[PDB]
Design a protein around this ligand. Structure first.
Ligand SMILES: NC(=O)c1ccc[n+]([C@@H]2O[C@H](COP(=O)([O-])OP(=O)(O)OC[C@H]3O[C@@H](n4cnc5c(N)ncnc54)[C@H](OP(=O)(O)O)[C@@H]3O)[C@@H](O)[C@H]2O)c1
Length: 316
């Protein structure tokens, strides 16, 4: 298992990264420092996570300490939905760059296909509770992302939470200048995503799997929800390989040619989650894990279901 995958912009992306959604601002600086110290070279970020300044403190300290060189890091962030407007994309990217202490991003993603009314609120609401859309169509947002490549702010651009038809809309854009490099989507044994992964891979788009552990810290978790880390069938595969359940859950997407971004702020787990390059799941293990699909989402985007570009009405 090579550590990096080749993107359609000609750059290499580490297949294992550290997630940062929900990482508390008072813990994420140490988490990222530990991650870099134990071998991580890819950090997944977003403005909407409200912790990029603190992530950036860690990156900058490790660059200053010469633990790593900038060219060895692969830093990803995402354009939030209230910035889909032509005239707001550059400033949103620059705010992320200034918070992360960087002069470029390796990859910048459209976080969701849904644009919202700009303003201070990340989910602007009408008086009845629906998100207020923007009329900017996503093809125009894509053109604004392409500009960022041409201005040197980002090395690669991509998408996140785009369904099959929305990916196709990007690929069929009149005058398309840069194809998406990545589609970052939820993916794990309970949401295996065969249809969408095959489509993206067939077009040369690399897929990143988010919430690979089933996001046990998601704010809306309920006791009755399925739990990947506690599933005895997955624990049994882990025991057979002398690995933890989390290690199996991370290795699984790697063997599907996916990038994977488990989140932790616990130093021991950050280290555990990196120790996934020294064992192999059999084809039978892989097919068995795929069989657990039930189309279950951590991230259903429930605050934007009324938006015309909501991605999860479609089968895939
Ligand atoms: N593009 C999008 O819309 C989107 C959506 C969701 C996620 N993401 C990205 O994907 C990342 C990962 O997804 P996620 O944060 O939803 O969840 P996840 O990575 O599936 O799970 C994170 C949870 O698992 C725990 N954990 C981590 N390693 C563990 C281990 N070895 N043993 C036991 N528990 C362990 C963490 O606890 P501790 O931290 O307390 O150790 C945390 O509660 C995010 O942080 C974000 O970067 C992107």
């Amino acid at each position: 298992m090579a550590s990096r995958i080749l993107l359609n912009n000609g750059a290499k992306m580490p297949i294992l990264g550290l997630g940062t959604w929900k990482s508390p601002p008072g813990q994420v600086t140490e988490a990222v420092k530990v991650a870099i110290d134990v071998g991580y070279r890819h950090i997944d970020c977003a403005h909407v996570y409200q912790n990029e300044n603190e992530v950036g403190v860690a990156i900058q300290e490790k660059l200053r300490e010469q633990v790593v060189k900038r060219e060895e890091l692969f830093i990803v962030s995402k354009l939030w939905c209230t910035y889909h407007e032509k005239g707001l994309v550059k400033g949103a990217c620059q705010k992320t760059l200034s918070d992360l202490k960087l002069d470029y991003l390796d990859l910048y993603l459209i976080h969701w296909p849904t644009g919202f009314k700009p303003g201070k609120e990340f989910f602007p609401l009408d008086e009845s509770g629906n998100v207020v859309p923007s009329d900017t169509n996503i093809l125009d947002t894509w053109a604004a992302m392409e500009e960022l490549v041409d201005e040197g702010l980002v090395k690669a651009i991509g998408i996140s939470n785009f369904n099959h038809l929305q990916v196709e809309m990007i690929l069929n854009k009149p005058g398309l200048k840069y194809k998406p490099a990545v589609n970052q989507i939820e993916c794990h044994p309970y949401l295996t995503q065969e249809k969408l992964i095959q489509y993206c891979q067939s077009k040369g788009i690399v897929v990143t799997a988010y919430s690979p552990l089933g996001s046990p810290d998601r704010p809306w978790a309920k006791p009755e929800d399925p739990s990947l880390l506690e599933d005895p069938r997955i624990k049994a595969i882990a025991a057979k390989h002398n690995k933890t359940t989390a290690q199996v859950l991370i290795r699984f997407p790697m063997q599907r040619n996916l990038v994977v971004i488990p989140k932790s702020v616990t130093p021991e787990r950050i280290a555990e989650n990196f120790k996934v390059f020294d064992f192999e799941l059999s084809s039978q293990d892989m097919t068995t894990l795929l069989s657990y699909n039930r189309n279950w989402r951590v991230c259903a985007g429930l605050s934007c279901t009324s938006h015309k570009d909501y991605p999860f009405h479609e089968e895939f």
